[PDB]
Structure 1
Amino acid sequence: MLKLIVKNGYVIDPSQNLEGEFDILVENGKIKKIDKNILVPEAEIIDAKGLIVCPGFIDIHVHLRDPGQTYKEDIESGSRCAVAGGFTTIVCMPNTNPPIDNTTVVNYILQKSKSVGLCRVLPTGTITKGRKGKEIADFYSLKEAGCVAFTDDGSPVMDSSVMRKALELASQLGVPIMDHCEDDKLAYGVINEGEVSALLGLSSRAPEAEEIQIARDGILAQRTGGHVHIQHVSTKLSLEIIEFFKEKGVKITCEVNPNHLLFTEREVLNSGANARVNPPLRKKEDRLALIEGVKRGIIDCFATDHAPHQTFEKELVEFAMPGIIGLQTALPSALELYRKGIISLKKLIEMFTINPARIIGVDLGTLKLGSPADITIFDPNKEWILNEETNLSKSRNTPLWGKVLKGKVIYTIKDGKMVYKD
């Protein structure tokens, strides 16, 4: 088809302040027209009667495990989970093996992702060579090859001068630093420093490890004029510190893992190692703080931190790899904020689309005329379960395995081409 029409659906493009029941004409992979009752003879038709139409989702925090750990996930299985969950753009983390610290690894990922052809995969580079924390990586070669941000995820940068230098060089290049904030002297145990660690004697990770580094990062972003993006906020104090710096005009953004919105440290008692994550699931008071942070606009976007690990890496909590999968599970997770009247639907969509697009400085997350036809089509009320029938990840590491989910992607359209169908 030269021409596609998304018919009958309820359109929400928050970046344009557009809502209502419109059809969308796509041509040559781009948004052509948005208008009431559109028709062109033998233009291809997608029927979205009864469904929500919005811009393709953007997840700025995904581990594709490719190269080097592709038994956990790869670019193809990752890009399948992505599109199955409404994502037309994802940003992959650099903690692969070999790490993303040279242009050969960058180019391998770009070309492989181009072959898989489902989903835009945007790489990030490391902050330090090998993520070893000792020498700054080659920001310039890396940015020029296509990196959109620098992170040492899942390691913190412990030397403040290193973080200061990375922010300077990255800002000079017009790109953000994404920081995994967790001081390694205060966070080397396995779960939250709270009631479960006290009860069971599992080693703990202090909330202050995260807060100390957030405060540091906001100060450095203020002093350097760099843009820092805080990767996974998990406490109330963290959100109070972020807002302290936002209110001063500092370029600091943050994201929330839908898992910290659903679950507390007690999930360790119900899901064992499938609740092991960095930073940890905290207390009830922090969970509710995060929800209030999403409601009151402190948190800029949702980002899954899709972190696949095999089942043998998820047995005894003490020895488990930290991480939870979440690409396919993000939408219905966000949707219970909507059902509970905490956020509007528009607001939910912002946080999956234009908000993350502006954080990485990409012209996506939009249905503006002329922009690429990255479109997501969903049913906020349709039920399903993530199990062996529906799981597209090579891994299963989620406290939501086997639970009933409400809200589901019916179609994912990437550059005018359908890439996922329910």
Structure 2
Amino acid sequence: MLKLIVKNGYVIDPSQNLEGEFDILVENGKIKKIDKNILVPEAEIIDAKGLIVCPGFIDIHVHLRDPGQTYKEDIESGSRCAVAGGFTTIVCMPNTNPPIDNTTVVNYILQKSKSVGLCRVLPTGTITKGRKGKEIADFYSLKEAGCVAFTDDGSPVMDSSVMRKALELASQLGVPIMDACEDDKLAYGVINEGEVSALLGLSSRAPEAEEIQIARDGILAQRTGGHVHIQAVSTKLSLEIIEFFKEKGVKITCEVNPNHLLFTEREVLNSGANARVNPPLRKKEDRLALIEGVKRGIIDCFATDHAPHQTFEKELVEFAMPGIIGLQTALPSALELYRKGIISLKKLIEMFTINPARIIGVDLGTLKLGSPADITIFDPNKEWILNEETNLSKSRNTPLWGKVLKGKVIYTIKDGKMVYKD
């Protein structure tokens, strides 16, 4: 590995308004040149003919379950999922055990991720000590150790001064707060407060629980000057509120879990506990609004909230752990919107690359000369099935289990090294 060439693919680099049939030369893990028919003496070649070539995808919302819940997933299994899904960078959430609220846990993750060596794993810290919601965590030490953001995911912050103080201390450090928006007085049940909760009598989680905290966060972001990133947006009103603050110049970004683009609460009737997730799958009108928010640029990126749980944690809905895996299914799920002509291919790539890069302030999601050779190569049309043959997660918890997907990664490249191939 001095020299690599990605030949004959259809390159798309939205960060540079760059697209067409170009080759890419990689030198020492870095992007060296992008040009028609490049040829160099003694080069590694991967042939991308008929395929899409773009920056490595970045997922800013992943649960690696490591430390403490490694029977669900661990840094290795999650990293394999990531790269098999086209991700060269993932941000891991801090609801591990022990939680990421000290530099020992950060370092453990960084070192283990280096040993695994497939994608870049960027840790976040908790907003509060122990994620108990009471006292701000040591942002200064956690950022210095490598945390890129603070969240209490998957717990909301209930005290408004705690959230304000988080935003103040984080912005002072130049990093965002990622907020898990669900007021715990209005969201302590198991599924959406809609038709399915009404029909079955399952306890519910009110859409206002999410909306009220998003509105709170926009106001706090506005008044503190901090940047708040809203995780897994799930309702129409939510998007309206976000846009209202974006219109004012507030540093508020957001993401959508592709599952919320594909499924409604009705999925609880078809997939049972594999449709239990926080925030819940909500109504048709919400699903369609989300797609509209993707189209209109209100939703800044796709992020999986890859949240693996074992099958015995996905039995009776009432007792089931919330969450859906998604790293391996993000791309075909997104490509569904491309196929319906809702978004362009460039737009889909933006949402996986440069947009998430800008949210967390990393110079990635790009094929700019001199930048790391993180490259994803994919077939928008290749069909496959997520099943035992194909699943890289330790867990299986997704309503897309066993269903036909269209769109698939052929190559994932990280610092000029092929870390995944079909």
Normalised by the length of structure 1, the TM-score is 1.00
Aligned partner of 2:138 in structure 1 is 138
CA drift at 1:114: 0.2
SS at match of 1:408: strand
Mapped to 1, the partners of 2:16 and 2:420 lie a distance apart of: 25
CA drift at 1:399: 0.2
Aligned partner of 2:14 in structure 1 is 14
Deviation per CA, 1:255-299: give whole Å up to 9, x if none.
Answer: 000000000000000000000000000000000000000000000
SS at match of 2:352: coil
Mapped to 1, the partners of 2:108 and 2:195 lie a distance apart of: 45
Mapped to 1, the partners of 2:45 and 2:284 lie a distance apart of: 47
Mapped to 1, the partners of 2:14 and 2:280 lie a distance apart of: 32
RMSD: 0.3
Deviation per CA, 1:339-383: give whole Å up to 9, x if none.
Answer: 000000000000000000000000000000000000000000000
Deviation per CA, 1:31-73: give whole Å up to 9, x if none.
Answer: 0000000000220000000000000000000000000000000
Mapped to 1, the partners of 2:8 and 2:289 lie a distance apart of: 38
CA drift at 1:188: 0.2
Mapped to 1, the partners of 2:351 and 2:284 lie a distance apart of: 23
CA drift at 1:304: 0.2
SS at match of 1:351: helix
Deviation per CA, 1:217-261: give whole Å up to 9, x if none.
Answer: 000000000000000100000000000000000000000000000
Aligned partner of 2:164 in structure 1 is 164
CA drift at 1:13: 0.2
5+ long unaligned stretches in structure 1: none
SS at match of 1:241: helix
Deviation per CA, 1:181-227: give whole Å up to 9, x if none.
Answer: 00000000000000100100000000000000000000000000000
Mapped to 1, the partners of 2:27 and 2:42 lie a distance apart of: 13
Mapped to 2, the partners of 1:12 and 1:128 lie a distance apart of: 40
Mapped to 2, the partners of 1:117 and 1:142 lie a distance apart of: 22
Name the count of aligned residue pairs.
422
Deviation per CA, 1:285-317: give whole Å up to 9, x if none.
Answer: 000000000000000000000000000000000
Mapped to 2, the partners of 1:2 and 1:18 lie a distance apart of: 25
Deviation per CA, 1:92-115: give whole Å up to 9, x if none.
Answer: 000000000000000000000000
Mapped to 2, the partners of 1:196 and 1:77 lie a distance apart of: 34
Mapped to 2, the partners of 1:271 and 1:134 lie a distance apart of: 36
CA drift at 1:398: 0.1
CA drift at 1:388: 0.1
Aligned partner of 1:105 in structure 2 is 105
Mapped to 2, the partners of 1:93 and 1:125 lie a distance apart of: 8
Mapped to 1, the partners of 2:2 and 2:119 lie a distance apart of: 21
Mapped to 2, the partners of 1:34 and 1:25 lie a distance apart of: 6
Mapped to 2, the partners of 1:7 and 1:324 lie a distance apart of: 36
SS at match of 2:377: strand
Mapped to 1, the partners of 2:65 and 2:198 lie a distance apart of: 33
SS at match of 1:69: coil
Mapped to 2, the partners of 1:41 and 1:109 lie a distance apart of: 39
Aligned partner of 2:73 in structure 1 is 73
Mapped to 2, the partners of 1:259 and 1:148 lie a distance apart of: 25
CA drift at 1:2: 1.1
Mapped to 2, the partners of 1:92 and 1:225 lie a distance apart of: 25
CA drift at 1:158: 0.1
Mapped to 2, the partners of 1:232 and 1:335 lie a distance apart of: 19
CA drift at 1:28: 0.4
Aligned partner of 1:26 in structure 2 is 26
Mapped to 2, the partners of 1:203 and 1:172 lie a distance apart of: 40
Mapped to 1, the partners of 2:283 and 2:124 lie a distance apart of: 31
Deviation per CA, 1:308-328: give whole Å up to 9, x if none.
Answer: 000000000000000000000
Mapped to 2, the partners of 1:103 and 1:41 lie a distance apart of: 46
- After superposing on structure 2, the runs of 4+ consecutive aligned residues of structure 1 that deviate more than 6 Å are none
Aligned partner of 2:48 in structure 1 is 48
Aligned partner of 2:278 in structure 1 is 278
Mapped to 2, the partners of 1:349 and 1:194 lie a distance apart of: 33
SS at match of 1:413: strand
Mapped to 2, the partners of 1:81 and 1:337 lie a distance apart of: 22
SS at match of 1:211: helix
Mapped to 2, the partners of 1:85 and 1:279 lie a distance apart of: 23
Mapped to 1, the partners of 2:172 and 2:208 lie a distance apart of: 31
Mapped to 2, the partners of 1:82 and 1:404 lie a distance apart of: 19
Mapped to 1, the partners of 2:134 and 2:285 lie a distance apart of: 37
Q: Is 1:82 aligned to 2:82, yes or no? A: yes
SS at match of 1:282: coil
Aligned partner of 1:265 in structure 2 is 265
Paired-residue identity, %: 100
Mapped to 2, the partners of 1:282 and 1:133 lie a distance apart of: 27
Mapped to 1, the partners of 2:217 and 2:297 lie a distance apart of: 19
Q: Is 1:310 aligned to 2:319, yes or no? A: no
Deviation per CA, 1:165-188: give whole Å up to 9, x if none.
Answer: 000000000000000000000000
SS at match of 2:78: helix
Mapped to 2, the partners of 1:172 and 1:87 lie a distance apart of: 30
SS at match of 1:83: helix
Mapped to 2, the partners of 1:220 and 1:135 lie a distance apart of: 18
Aligned partner of 2:202 in structure 1 is 202
